[PDB]
Amino acid sequence: DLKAFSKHIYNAYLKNFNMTKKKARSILTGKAPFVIHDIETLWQAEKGLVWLPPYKEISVHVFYRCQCTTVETVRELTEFAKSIPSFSSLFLNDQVTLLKYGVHEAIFAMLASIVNKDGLLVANGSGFVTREFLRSLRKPFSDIIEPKFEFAVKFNALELDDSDLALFIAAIILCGDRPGLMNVPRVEAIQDTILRALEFHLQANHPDAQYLFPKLLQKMADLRQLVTEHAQMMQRIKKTETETSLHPLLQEIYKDM
Ligand SMILES: CC(C)(Oc1ccc(CCNC(=O)c2ccc(Cl)cc2)cc1)C(=O)O
Ligand SMILES: CCCCCCCCO[C@@H]1O[C@H](CO)[C@@H](O)[C@H](O)[C@H]1O
After folding, report:
1. Using a 6 Å cutoff on CB, does residue 253 contact ligand 1?
2. Cα angle at 111 between 137 and 198, to 5 degrees?
3. Interior CA angle at 76 toward 133 and 88, to 5°?
4. What is the rounded CA–CA span in Å between residue 12 and residue 81?
5. Dist. CA 5–CA 191, nearest whole Å
6. Does the Cβ of 97 fall within 6 Å of ligand 1?
7. Ligand 2 touching residue 88 (CB < 6 A)
8. How far is CA 22 from the centre of its chain?
9. Which residues are within 8 A (CB) of 171 and not within 5 positions of it... i.e. 6 or more apart?
């Protein structure tokens, strides 16, 4: 039962995310992606080696590739969530509310899967963008990406696997305290089932792990703070970078944060 619940969640995760952490870990270790570390390699990646609104400048261009990637992850997360029968039993507007406030927490948790201390995979693992290059970007674009790295490196210490991640992200999305939910008790009851499924699953999958479940609850709290700070950087970019186009779906997500 609690196993059939988790296994259903794990299959919805494999069914919907192109890049698993297993796939990613193969590539980052070497079982190779074109490395983008400066303007020249970026241009080469675009010419066809690895790959939008009208061009503006390099730092805005990278930001657009960020937007394109996160919009795609939002689409996958939505399909993943609709593939959870309990999620799909909420009223559609509550489903949207959960996604609105949950996807970025889930995106920054999943980002850890494709990152190491030196950069991150792009374009389905065919490119690799260095943390160095990202840091070099014009402000404020260089400050938005670096904190995700700090979180991702500590997060990867936990050494979760894809079966853990599927339950963790389900728990991030099925969150009872999002503003404007209609049926708080029903969502709270679903979240509780996922959390018990998670503790159960971690018991068997990480038998020697001390304090992993509470450590993961703290990561959920950490992700909430990451996304609050991220949304503050986005609102500032909206005010001061008026030439930078902002994808409409992402504008709706950030409207009231
Ligand atoms: C997209 C946007 C506006 O801001 C964000 C900025 C950065 C990241 C981290 C993920 N970045 C990437 O996946 C990424 C994609 C392509 C390139 Cl060339 C570099 C980095 C996530 C989100 C968002 O908040 O949705
Ligand atoms: C502003 C609110 C208008 C949107 C109304 C859509 C509500 C219907 O939403 C439906 O509810 C069902 C459970 O009742 C779910 O199983 C379905 O997935 C969902 O589509």
Report:
1. no
2. 155
3. 150
4. 8
5. 13
6. no
7. yes
8. 16
9. 191, 194, 195, 198, 220
Q: Which atom of ligand 2 is nearest to the CA of 82?
A: 18
Ligand 1 contact via 226 beta carbon (within 6 Å):
no
What was the structure determination method? X-ray
How does DSSP assign the chain, residue by residue? -HHHHHHHHHHHHHHH-SS-HHHHHHHHHT--PEEE-SHHHHHHIIIII---PPP--HHHHHHHHHHHHHHHHHHHHHHHHHTSHHHHTS-HHHHHHHHHHHHHHHHHHHHGGGEETTEEEETTTTEEEEHHHHHTSPTTHHHHHHHHHHHHHHHHHT---HHHHHHHHHHHHS-TT-TT-S-HHHHHHHHHHHHHHHHHHHHHHSTT-SSHHHHHHHHHHHHHHHHHHHHHHHHHHHHH-TTS---HHHHHHHTT-
Pocket test for ligand 1, best of 35, 64, 66 (most atoms within 8 A of CB): 66
